[PDB]
Design a protein around this ligand. Structure first.
Ligand SMILES: CCCCCCCCCCCCCCCCCC(=O)OC[C@H](COP(=O)([O-])OCC(O)COP(=O)([O-])OC[C@@H](COC(=O)CCCCCCCCCCCCCCCCC)OC(=O)CCCCCCCCCCCCCCCCC)OC(=O)CCCCCCCCCCCCCCCCC
Ligand code: BCL
Ligand code: BCL
Ligand code: BCL
Ligand code: BCL
Ligand SMILES: CC[C@H]1c2cc3[nH]c4c(c3C)C(=O)[C@H](C(=O)OC)c4c3nc(cc4[nH]c(cc(n2)[C@@H]1C)c(C(C)=O)c4C)[C@@H](C)[C@@H]3CCC(=O)OC/C=C(\C)CCC[C@H](C)CCC[C@H](C)CCCC(C)C
Ligand SMILES: COC1=C(OC)C(=O)C(C/C=C(\C)CC/C=C(\C)CC/C=C(\C)CC/C=C(\C)CC/C=C(\C)CC/C=C(\C)CC/C=C(\C)CC/C=C(\C)CC/C=C(\C)CCC=C(C)C)=C(C)C1=O
Ligand SMILES: COC(C)(C)C(=O)C/C=C(\C)CC/C=C(\C)CC/C=C(\C)CCCC/C(C)=C/CCC(C)CC/C=C(\C)CCC=C(C)C
Ligand SMILES: CCCCCCCCCCCC[N+](C)(C)[O-]
Ligand SMILES: CCCCCCCCCCCC[N+](C)(C)[O-]
Ligand SMILES: CCCCCCCCCCCC
Ligand SMILES: [Cl-]
Ligand SMILES: [Fe+3]
Lengths: 301, 240, 281
């Protein structure tokens, strides 16, 4: 009856300071603390973390983005902490009105702060992307993580940058607020004739559902063969074991085809990549090429 | 219309992607075989991919796939029917012969290495700095099989050093020898370790390892397959 | 018709019903009693859809739609053309899915592996059953279930959501979404990580899991580990569906007003309810 979801007995040894390869060791922190809590489910060890100039840039900008939104919120709360907590999900840092187009001439309280916040976000995200590339390179690894991250950045860029530019104003971009950005999302669909008629929205859902399907399948499969060392996937790729064979045959016998220990991760990365890839396409086409998806669907064109 | 061109182009892309993904996933186990081990007439609609070569660390060589597949071991099973598609019966003791859910693969008879080229799995007593950090420490507990008899006692954890995790319990038997039991196949309780997969009389048959301080990938596969096999093959000995 | 490594696994045993009667394969597919059951249910279901197609008029899969009984039938049976076919097809669908899960259990038993896969599938089945069985029954009518049609089931989704305003404001729905998004993120990162180690820079040796831990520690200050990531993917995916089911079972039953208004409970807490300023003062 043991299912290997939570560990029964945790072991700890000396802190693992990691592989060196071409990493600049001067930019690595010391190891952080060990969490017994985390250790029931994953690794207990926190850190070390690599923090070079590009990482410091990214973190600083991220915090500045976060703090810029926060300061606006406090202002909206009248600097009252009770109102701040009460109305937290209701505050919103909104982009410039359509009148200001794509210019940076809007006042601080009427779009200017939104532009400042967005600049910090832009720098944070893109510097984090370079860092994702560079940490892989220092370890001699492939750039798959950076290539995937680019597909996610695509949707984000379309929503806040590329689409607004193509539509001729920052007013088209997403506001920074919990409820407000949900309101924006709902409105976006209403104004574009219901996104359920956008074929790329449909695809995006297929892949989003499909990612849950696939990770349920894969996660379950690997736990099911963990009694044969199944989760040691790199060595199973290099030297197929009974874990890998039983995993394949479960699926072969169930649905008539199967994967390999390596190839399932290609299915994985692509399922997830295609969520934001098709998504960004669907959003970018909305209002630039297609004003109304229902109308488009009736044609189709 | 640009959206029409986009969606049309996307479906063409998706078909090619699926074709690519399927062929990538034929790098093990293909070409398909008949039950007698000869090549099957029907290989499906996907051709084998062009080979790739993995360069293995620590002078372990390379792996090129797809490549000539062979089991590299005798398989003690025989047909139960005169036509294709039926089960194959063990010709001896399937636990001893390593077939069915007791199967193992002829993996490399060397241990998995960590990134620094040291053995990935070691007994905790030889693993410097390693200790139990939380949960019930199983070392010293009696080990009970599915027949509700004591098969032995826990004398160490085997630990994954890089991933800081318990991987096997080492159990000493009545004769003073020891066996490894996969950590995923035991239940640590306050007063015992219980093993549902095996009855007490089957512990002696757990494949032994050659060295006291390391386990090879071949050894792990034999141990793990054997223990998993008991769920099917020890069922008449499993008290309910 | 076998993988090169498959024969040694094709032994007798593992069946839950029938002994050896259905213990065989067709090509790659394992049969068993529940394979026969799945076939029966799936075939009857598809036949009844194909026939419902005719009573509707069409053979275009983008038009074919089987609607549940109108609300006036309540929880009773309905004539075949006016809901009965939907009811029978729903029984077949449930039978098919459950038989598929139990067949997976037989396959686990023959292979000596854990039952994690059919356990996970059962979450999907329960989500399906929440929408066509549990919710409709709690609301007193089969007509609250979704119709079986490629596009018509999407009509039901927006119709049902907009009954409660912007459905974004369902708090269980918010949690469900957060798990779906995080699951897709984790799936991406896992696939990319393994492939980045297995397929390193040209000419280099395969990396090890130590390199995988190191990459993520360098990047975010933590690595969950190779066991942890598979546990996480399973958790996130199943939690997404659990909260999906929850967000719907409570809608039209416990809560049936505009979801946006639910949130006033927080705003109206006595200690800050009447403090001037902000959005709500
Ligand atoms: C408009 C949208 C604009 C927005 C763009 C957003 C950006 C989205 C990019 C997402 C791509 C994710 C890629 C995942 C991946 O596998 O990358 C590894 C892959 C290898 O990484 P590496 O570290 O250089 O190689 C390490 C190993 O040596 C070797 O590593 P390896 O062997 O693991 O990887 C080899 C990899 C090599 O990958 C490639 O050749 C490039 C694939 C990128 C395809 C881009 C897809 C976008 C198309 C959408 C359709 C639009 C329709 C409208 O093989 C493939 O992935 C083949 C893909 C199959 C495509 C099928 C095409 C069917 C056409 C129909 C006929 O990435 C690249 O080669 C460069 C990607 C550049 C981006
Ligand atoms: C009423 C609203 C409209 C609608 C409007 C839109 C709009 C508008 C969009 C989508 C988009 C999507 N919709 Mg839709 N959507 C509707 C109905 C649905 C239904 C349904 C069952 O009815 C479903 C399943 C979906 C599903 C989807 C997704 C497949 C897709 C987003 C993918 C993704 O990962 O985004 C998440 C990706 C992100 C980059 C954002 C999440 C960020 C990451 C993943 C999480 C980080 C959070 C971090 C931990 C915390 C940060 C701190 C805070 C700042 C405090 N929609 C209805 C019809 N939908 C997007 C799309 O691609 O459309 C084509 C999009 O732009
Ligand atoms: C989950 C919440 C809502 C819902 C909301 C939405 C929304 C919103 C969307 C879909 C979309 C889809 N939904 Mg729906 N859908 C629901 C319930 C279901 C059920 C079910 C039995 O419960 C099924 C079978 C489907 C099936 C489908 C697909 C037609 C399409 C892509 C899904 C996908 O790739 O998933 C992940 C699974 C995989 C990738 C594996 C492949 C699964 C294949 C594609 C299933 C085909 C089903 C087939 C056409 C019909 C049954 C076949 C029988 C033999 C007759 N939905 C419930 C009621 N669904 C999208 C669409 O484009 O619709 C037109 C879309 O935008
Ligand atoms: C994709 C189309 C839309 C969009 C549509 C939606 C929709 C629809 C939803 C979100 C949600 C979220 N979005 Mg959004 N989102 C978009 C773009 C973005 C971008 C971006 C940089 O592009 C960001 C940073 C965000 C940020 C966020 C987060 C604030 C939030 C959940 C994050 C998450 O996955 O946590 C991961 C965390 C977990 C997996 C753990 C679970 C706990 C989390 C924190 C649940 C929080 C919800 C709430 C507070 C719970 C209340 C219940 C009470 C406790 C009783 N959005 C675009 C514009 N987004 C969800 C939300 O909760 O909004 C409030 C939501 O429902
Ligand atoms: C206007 C519409 C409303 C809205 C109204 C609704 C409604 C209404 C519903 C959801 C539901 C969901 N919505 Mg919402 N939703 C909106 C906006 C969004 C947005 C967004 C970005 O704006 C997102 C991300 C979501 C996200 C979600 C998910 C949390 C949830 C769907 C997954 C699910 O139930 O899976 C569960 C999976 C299944 C049901 C699939 C079961 C599969 C079965 C078991 C097997 C099928 C086999 C099949 C027949 C194939 C065989 C043939 C071939 C061999 C393949 N919504 C807007 C605001 N949303 C649904 C939900 O939570 O349902 C519980 C729901 O009913
Ligand atoms: C619980 C987490 C996620 C999950 C997990 C999951 N799904 C799974 C599994 C698991 C672990 C399997 O093992 C199993 C499988 O074999 O996958 C390959 C399965 C499965 N998930 C599937 C689909 C699926 N899963 C989904 C969702 C999810 N599955 C979750 C997000 C979805 C959606 C909409 O999100 C879909 C469409 C199937 C590919 C497969 C199950 C196949 C099966 O049950 O086969 C037997 C039945 C038939 C072959 C045909 C039945 C025909 C009916 C009698 C008639 C049709 C009636 C139907 C209701 C009409 C619907 C019309 C639509 C237009 C709405
Ligand atoms: C590491 O390990 C792992 C493997 O292997 C090493 C694996 O393969 C897999 C499996 C994953 C894949 C192969 C990736 C691709 C999978 C998806 C994207 C998920 C979606 C899958 C589908 C859409 C296929 C659906 C197919 C089905 C449901 C079968 C179709 C049904 C039939 C044609 C007939 C089925 C037979 C019946 C009815 C019963 C018995 C036969 C008869 C009576 C006749 C995983 C997760 C894994 O982690
Ligand atoms: C506790 O109090 C203090 C003050 C300490 C705080 O720190 C409080 C902080 C908060 C309360 C923070 C609250 C934060 C939120 C609620 C944030 C919400 C964020 C979202 C929901 C964001 C959603 C979507 C955003 C998107 C899609 C943005 C995309 C942006 C871009 C693509 C960037 C575009 C760049 C532009 C327009 C400028 C570019 C100019 C150049 C010159 C490059
Ligand atoms: C990893 C690739 C495999 C997944 C294939 C998904 C196909 C989904 C079909 C949905 C089509 C809906 N659209 C987009 C026509 O509305
Ligand atoms: C969206 C999922 C895509 C399903 C892919 C279907 C292709 C499976 C066919 C593989 C045939 C197996 N053979 C015959 C190669 O062994
Ligand atoms: C998404 C469309 C369903 C695809 C079903 C594929 C079935 C593959 C059977 C393999 C036969 C060997
Ligand atoms: Cl990242
Ligand atoms: Fe994996």
């Amino acid at each position: 009856e043991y299912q290997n979801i939570f560990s029964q007995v945790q072991v700890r040894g000396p802190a693992d300071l990691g592989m060196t390869e071409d990493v600049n060791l001067a930019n690595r922190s010391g190891v952080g603390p060990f969490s017994t809590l985390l250790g029931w489910f994953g690794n207990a060890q926190l850190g070390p973390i690599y923090l070079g100039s590009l990482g410091v840039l990214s973190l600083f900008s991220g915090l500045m983005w976060f703090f810029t939104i926060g300061i606006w919120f406090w202002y909206q709360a009248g600097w009252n902490p009770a109102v701040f907590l009460r109305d937290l999900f209701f505050f919103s840092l909104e982009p410039p009105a359509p009148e200001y187009g794509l210019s940076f001439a809007a006042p601080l309280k009427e779009g200017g702060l939104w532009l400042i916040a967005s600049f910090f976000m832009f720098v944070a995200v893109w510097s984090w992307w370079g860092r994702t590339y560079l940490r892989a390179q220092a370890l001699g690894m492939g750039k798959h993580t950076a290539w995937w991250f680019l597909s996610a950045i695509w949707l984000w860029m379309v929503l806040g940058f590329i689409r607004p530019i193509l539509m001729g104003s920052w007013s088209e971009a997403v506001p920074y607020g919990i409820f407000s950005h949900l309101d924006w999302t709902n409105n976006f669909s209403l104004v574009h004739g219901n996104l359920f008629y956008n074929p790329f929205h449909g695809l995006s859902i297929a892949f989003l559902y499909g990612s849950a399907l696939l990770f349920a399948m894969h996660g379950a499969t690997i736990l099911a063969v963990s009694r044969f060392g199944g989760e040691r996937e790199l060595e199973q790729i290099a030297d197929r074991g009974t874990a890998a064979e039983r995993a394949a045959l479960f699926w072969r016998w169930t649905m008539g085809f199967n994967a390999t220990m390596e190839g399932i991760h290609r299915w994985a990365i692509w399922m997830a990549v295609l969520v934001t890839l098709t998504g960004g396409i669907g959003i970018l086409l909305s209002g630039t090429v297609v004003d109304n998806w229902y109308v488009w669907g009736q044609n189709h064109g | 219309d640009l959206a029409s061109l986009a969606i049309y182009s996307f479906w063409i892309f998706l078909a090619g992607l699926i074709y690519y993904l399927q062929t990538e996933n034929m790098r093990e186990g293909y070409p398909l075989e008949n039950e007698d081990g000869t090549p099957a007439a029907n290989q499906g609609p996907f051709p084998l991919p062009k080979p790739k070569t993995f360069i293995l660390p620590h002078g372990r060589g390379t792996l090129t796939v797809p490549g000539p597949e062979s089991e590299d071991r005798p398989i003690a099973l025989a047909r139960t029917a005169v036509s294709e598609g039926f089960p194959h019966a063990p010709t001896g003791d399937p636990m001893k012969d390593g077939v069915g859910p007791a199967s193992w693969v002829a993996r490399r008879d060397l241990p998995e290495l960590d990134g620094h080229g040291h053995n990935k799995i070691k007994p905790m007593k030889a693993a410097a700095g390693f200790h139990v950090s939380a949960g019930k420490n199983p070392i010293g507990l009696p080990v009970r099989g599915c027949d509700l008899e004591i098969a032995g006692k826990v004398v160490d954890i085997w630990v994954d050093i890089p991933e800081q995790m318990a991987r096997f319990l080492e159990v000493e038997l009545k004769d003073g020898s020891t066996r490894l039991l996969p950590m995923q196949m035991v239940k640590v309780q306050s007063n015992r370790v219980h093993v549902n997969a095996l009855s007490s009389d089957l512990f002696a048959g757990i494949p032994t390892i050659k060295s006291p301080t390391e386990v090879t990938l071949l050894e792990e596969d034999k141990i793990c397959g054997y223990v998993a096999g008991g769920l099917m093959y020890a069922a008449p000995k499993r008290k309910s | 018709a076998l993988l090169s490594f498959e024969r040694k696994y094709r032994v007798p045993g593992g069946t839950l019903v029938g002994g050896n009667l259905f213990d065989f394969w067709v090509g790659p597919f394992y049969v068993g009693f529940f394979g026969v059951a799945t076939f029966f249910f799936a075939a009857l279901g598809i036949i009844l859809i194909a026939w419902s197609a005719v009573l509707q008029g069409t053979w275009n899969p983008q038009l074919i739609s089987v609607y549940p009984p109108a609300l006036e039938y309540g929880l009773g049976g309905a004539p075949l053309a006016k809901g009965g076919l939907w009811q029978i097809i729903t029984i077949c669908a449930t039978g098919a899915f459950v038989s598929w899960a139990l067949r997976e259990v037989e396959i686990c038993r023959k292979l000596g592996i854990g039952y994690h896969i059919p356990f996970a599938f059962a979450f999907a089945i329960l989500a399906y059953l929440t929408l066509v069985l549990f919710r409709p029954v709690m609301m007193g009518a089969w007509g609250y279930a979704f119709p079986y049609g490629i596009w018509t089931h999407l009509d039901w989704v927006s119709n049902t959501g907009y009954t409660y305003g912007n459905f974004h404001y369902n708090p269980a729905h918010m949690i469900a979404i957060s798990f779906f998004f995080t699951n897709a993120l984790a799936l991406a990162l896992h696939g990319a990580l393994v492939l980045s180690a297995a397929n390193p820079e040209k000419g280099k040796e395969m990396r090890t899991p130590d390199h995988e831990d190191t990459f993520f520690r360098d990047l975010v200050g933590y690595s969950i580990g190779t066991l942890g990531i598979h546990r996480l993917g399973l958790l996130l995916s199943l939690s997404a569906v659990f909260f999906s089911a929850l967000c719907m079972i409570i809608t039209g039953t416990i809560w049936f007003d505009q979801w946006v208004d639910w949130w006033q409970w927080w705003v109206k807490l006595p200690w800050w309810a009447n403090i001037p300023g902000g959005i709500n003062g």
